[PDB]
Amino acid sequence: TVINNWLLIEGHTIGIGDSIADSKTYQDIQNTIKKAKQDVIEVIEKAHNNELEPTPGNTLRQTFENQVNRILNDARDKTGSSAQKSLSEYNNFKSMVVSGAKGSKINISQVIAVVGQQNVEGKRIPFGFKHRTLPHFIKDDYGP
């Protein structure tokens, strides 16, 4: 009762102003994504040249997926941390996450920085079509 009657004086809200971040933060998120895509490309080129060495207990396909997923996950988490740095004290997403009432740091990251990798059955999106995920992509594309 007491806190809900004080909240009439203070008030709470969620708006688009909370989702939006500084321009510097957006540029940092974009740079992280650019270099992550370049790293995935380098891993792919190593795999094509057969320079990649299999991780013990794993096939080369499994170890390629492991390394690619590690790169993409590190990029995802780093973009999320940049977004979370951008949040001000007044930001209401942060108010709810900090108080623990609802939400999580993951949700803030997905709202502001990067939705992240979409996994189905524990793997990246599978090749439903012949050797390609969707008809728009080229055959044998393991890129991000």
């Binding site: 993409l72 995802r76 997905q110 939705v115 992240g116 189905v120």
Partner: peptide
Amino acid sequence: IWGIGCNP
């Protein structure tokens, strides 16, 4: 919808 280690 996040990553392989997270949730879908």
